[model samples]
Target: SLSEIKHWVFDMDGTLTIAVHDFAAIREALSIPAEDDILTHLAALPADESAAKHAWLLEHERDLAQGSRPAPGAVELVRELAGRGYRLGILTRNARELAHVTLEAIGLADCFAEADVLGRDEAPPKPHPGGLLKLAEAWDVSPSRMVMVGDYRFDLDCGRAAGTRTVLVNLPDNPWPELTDWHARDCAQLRDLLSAE
Candidate 1:
């Protein structure tokens, strides 16, 4: 039951904020092919070229982060969860500084502590369980009793690999339904689900 869940690790971009990332636009800007992983493709490039590309990506992300707003009902959900003593955390592919900026833009800077936020650089990015395990260890909680809440495949994959229960939130359709233990349209729906539980 959700009653056992005392820790929640959320994905930052599309999960917490109204989805602003346009992969198509990003890939076009980077000259990557359709549906390609930008970082992976960049990694194949020469170090200097990769660094240049990363610089552009970072700049773009900062602009997006600063302009972002919270997903509908996310503020309330996060506030309620925090007030109830759940340890809220973040696991984002974005940089650590950008994560903080995004949270501040969304009015959630107070909800997460410095140590609770993990950017890609802090651990390994999502789809690898390393970050989740780090959070679990730091929180001194079993992975099984924690819930990974996000809106993407990488988030679900990471949770699955870490042995945590998973929920796909703010995602209208669960593209990989099997990867998620639960799915909600948004924080409002998730809050309703919790109320019923």
Candidate 2:
């Protein structure tokens, strides 16, 4: 009955892949400092500066997406899931091109060939239900039947907004009270849980 779940949506970045270069590399390339938390800094900036940084982040996403390495077992896990008839979706904050590049970089470009890959610009970004709800609608499934897996609070928040089940991956400390849903250490563990159910 695992296949009956219909949709499995994933987050990019820390979930599916690791950076090809270290954080320092990205920071240096972007001229951001190690001490500078981009999200925090952006939040503190003037609207114009925040907008500029966001724009820059988008442009440079390709650099990381193209250069990022796959998380261990990502390709094999995707293959197995696809083979088992699970409908796949990618709900990511990255742009479509960069997402695809990252998927391909991880040898999973074809894993979700029959699935939807919605990016930030494609709909509202995560932490909102718009994209996830739209995905459920398009797939002719209810959000309850969907499983959202990611490594951040925003990922879990987006799934929650859509009324879907949430699975957190690689969350440090697991200290967030909002992370009360199912949890896994990796994609394989998630697959195992789904299969067991």
Candidate 3:
């Protein structure tokens, strides 16, 4: 079961932290049509229009970061995992500054330490394996000894690419399609799973 797991890599936005993605807020901030989800609309656009969406996202990232909050038991889970002698790492598609703001706001700034937080610009973001691979290198551990936990397909994909086990933090009645290697109800369940093993 995960007896050899020496490092844990976590995702940010939808996993450790819960945030209202507020398509309306994004539309208002970007002066775009409010009818569609920003991601969907951006994905359907051609290169130039998609570029504009990326610019808008970067321009107002602070507002997005400020709008986020920690998921249930997130801080405590990090503490418990660390206490259990597992190295913790963050691998997310967020800007480093925004990640810092979110973690600090949730009082988990000290939980990861400077060396463990890997943001988008730190390397290729998931579902690319680069960030997780970097973390494995930093910890001097093989990717096989690491566990990547998050709430999305890209998170699982990244873990697979990095050769680590993947855990899905899925909520009850979650409508998303099943795509992870293993599933848990929340961070607490994840800690319990690790401890039980």
Candidate 4:
């Protein structure tokens, strides 16, 4: 049950903030092939090229973060979760600095502490269990006692691989429902369910 959850981890971009990033546009601007995953494509490039692309990506992400807005009930849910003594953390593909910028822009900067917010710089990106395992270790909690909430399959897959309870939110068209332990249409609905718990 959600009542047993002691730690709450979230994906930063589309999950917490409104899904305003036009990934396709970002891909085009970054010269990432339409068929490729942006981060993966960047990682496969030569060192110099990768560095250049990474810089370009960070620039775009910062620009996006400046305009970020919270998803419905995001602020209230985080506040409620904190009030209930749940440890809140963020795991995002974005860089740590940009993640903070997004949080501040969305008015959620105070809900999370610096240590709990992990970025691509802090660990291998999502869909990798490194960051989740690190957070679980840091919190001294079993992965099963934590809930990983995100809007994308990578987030759910990372949670599943780490043995955490996975909640897919805001992605009604989930391509991998089998990886999700639960589903919510938005943060508002998920907050209602958690509040009830």
The C-alpha lDDT values of all candidates are: 0.85, 0.75, 0.80, 0.84
In model 3, the runs with Cα more than 4 Å from the true position are 21-66, 173-179
Residue-by-residue lDDT tens digits, candidate 1, 55-98: 99888885444356688778988998898888999998889999
Candidate 1: C-alpha lDDT: 0.85
Candidates arranged by lDDT, highest first: 1, 4, 3, 2
lDDT of 2: 0.75
State the lDDT of candidate 2 residue by residue for 1-197, as single tens digits. 44466678888877887665345655665567568886776777789977887787777765655456766556666788888787888888888888888787677888775348888677787798888887899889989899887888888888888998787866543655574377767766766766787
- Expressed as tens digits, the lDDT of each residue in 1-197 for candidate 4 is 88679799999777888745667667777798878888899899899999987887778765644455788777888888888878999998888999988888777788888999999888897799999998999999999999999988889989998999998888655567699877888888888887676
The segments of candidate 1 whose C-alpha lies over 4 angstroms from its true place after superposition are 20-66
Cα error, candidate 4, residue 179 (Å): 1.1
TM-score of each: 0.74, 0.70, 0.71, 0.74
In terms of lDDT, the poorest run of 10 residues in model 4 is 60-69
Higher-TM-score candidate among 1 and 2? 1
Judging by lDDT against the true structure, name the best candidate. 1
Question: Once model 3 is optimally superposed onto the true structure by TM-score, how far is the C-alpha of residue 38 displaced, in angstroms?
Answer: 23
- The residue pairs that clash in candidate 3, if any, are none
